[PDB]
């Protein structure tokens, strides 16, 4: 499965995920992006059962963007989290369930950075760090024994590199590239991905 790992900084949240989309034999695309722009200061990472994730996020995004325009003020990351989860609870028991595991992270001026862990059963949780997919058991420990309550930007990226570096060591298949984004007071920015020669 894909990888959704996030670190809650003192005044920022760095969330990263892969860029490999594969259909049961092979990575179909290598530049596929799996982190969605909820708003100017909130991001969405939806993995899980195919088909459902691509659209459920787009629906959550349209309704998070819709709120940002019909009101003039963007939804707070905690409100967005409650809403994204709220939708899943309604449809989970319906006849068209959304079997998607999602990760939500963003920045709120009043309160600060936040990172919420979303399970396919639509169970919300605020955690300093989290991992999604199968690899979760592989790097969740890496954060546990390595995380600090005041990870700086430079040390934050290094940790994921160690988190990503370990993944390349054990994970059976290939994840050549990963997406890395930073959410801060001035917005959401893009960082460089990673690669490793094997010749």
């Amino acid at each position: 499965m894909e990888y959704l790992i996030g670190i809650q900084g003192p005044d920022y949240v760095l969330v990263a995920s892969d860029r490999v989309a594969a259909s049961n034999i092979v990575q179909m695309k290598d530049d596929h992006d799996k982190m969605f722009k909820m708003s100017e200061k909130i991001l969405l990472l939806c993995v899980g059962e195919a088909g459902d994730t691509v659209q459920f996020a787009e629906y959550i995004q349209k309704n998070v963007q819709l709120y940002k325009m019909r009101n003039g003020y963007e939804l707070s990351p905690t409100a967005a989290a409650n809403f994204t989860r709220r939708n899943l609870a309604d449809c989970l028991r319906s006849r068209t369930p959304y079997h998607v595991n999602l990760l939500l992270a963003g920045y709120d001026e009043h309160e600060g950075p936040a990172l919420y862990y979303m399970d396919y059963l639509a169970a919300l949780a605020k955690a300093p760090f989290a991992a999604h997919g199968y690899g979760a058991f592989l790097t969740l420990s890496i954060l546990d024994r390595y995380y600090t309550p005041t990870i700086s930007r430079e040390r934050a990226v290094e940790l994921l590199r160690k988190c990503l570096e370990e993944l390349q060591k054990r994970f059976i298949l290939n994840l050549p590239t990963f997406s890395v984004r930073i959410i801060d007071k001035n917005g959401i920015h893009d960082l460089d991905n990673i690669s490793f020669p094997k010749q």
């Binding site: 963007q65 819709l66 019909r70």
Partner: protein, 239 residues
């Protein structure tokens, strides 16, 4: 005796209720919209709000999507509902088709909703005429006017609301390719056109300026003040 039902045709084939509804648009604050090569402007007149009321909730220029904005006239109650439905339609169209809603498509949906409301009894026509303008064409500026009846039209520069006739007459005799060759001159043209309808000082004109691949920029009173100062300087030069 043929003006008491929407679905009743007058002996001369007039749907009189829709014509009466347009009268509601005739009673609103003037809206002037002119599109340039790299800019689309939506002029508006403020109504000198009461001394003891906040003007934040009197927004008359609202953006349906991230790059499409509309200025309406007529009764605010119907305009708000039309704006909300337009926003929901734009977010649904994006959902079904990833391509952002075109200005033409949003104007068409607004016209369709208005027509559906003016097609049968028990549903009063929307008494707001909307000027939908946006660069949604991905490199082409477009401006549209949705009449309360339900028909839309592409306008290089059109006026709605009170004084629409005078503003349209001014725009026709002054909107030339040399006029809108630059964004500043387009804004100056909007200000000049709205000046003849709204004779008053600052804060009586709200200008919504949108540039290519940008966001709406509701000009602060100072910038409108700067442009009015420039226009006064130009008039002094003419004299």
């Amino acid at each position: 005796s043929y003006d008491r039902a929407i679905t009743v045709f007058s002996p001369d084939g007039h749907l009189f209720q829709v014509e009466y509804a347009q009268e509601a648009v005739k009673k609103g604050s003037t809206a002037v919209g002119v599109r340039g090569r790299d800019i689309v402007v939506l002029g508006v007149e403020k109504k000198s709000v009461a001394k003891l009321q906040d003007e934040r909730t009197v927004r008359k220029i609202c953006a349906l999507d991230d790059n499409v904005c509309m200025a309406f006239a007529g009764l605010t109650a119907d305009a708000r509902i039309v704006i909300n439905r337009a926003r929901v339609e734009c977010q649904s169209h994006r959902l079904t088709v990833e391509d952002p809603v075109t200005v033409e498509y949003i104007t068409r949906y607004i016209a369709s909703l208005k027509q559906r409301y003016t097609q049968s009894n028990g549903r009063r026509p929307f008494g707001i005429s909307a000027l939908i303008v946006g660069f949604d064409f991905d490199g082409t500026p477009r401006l549209y006017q949705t009449d309360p009846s339900g028909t839309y039209h592409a306008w290089k520069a059109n006026a709605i609301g009170r004084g629409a006739k005078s503003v349209r007459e001014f725009l026709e005799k002054n909107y030339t390719d040399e006029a809108i060759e630059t964004d500043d001159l387009t804004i100056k043209l909007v200000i000049k056109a709205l000046l003849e309808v709204v004779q008053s000082g600052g804060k009586n004109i709200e200008l919504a300026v949108m540039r290519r691949d940008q966001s709406l920029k509701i000009l602060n009173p100072e910038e409108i003040e700067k442009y009015v100062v420039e226009i006064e300087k130009e008039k002094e030069e003419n004299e």
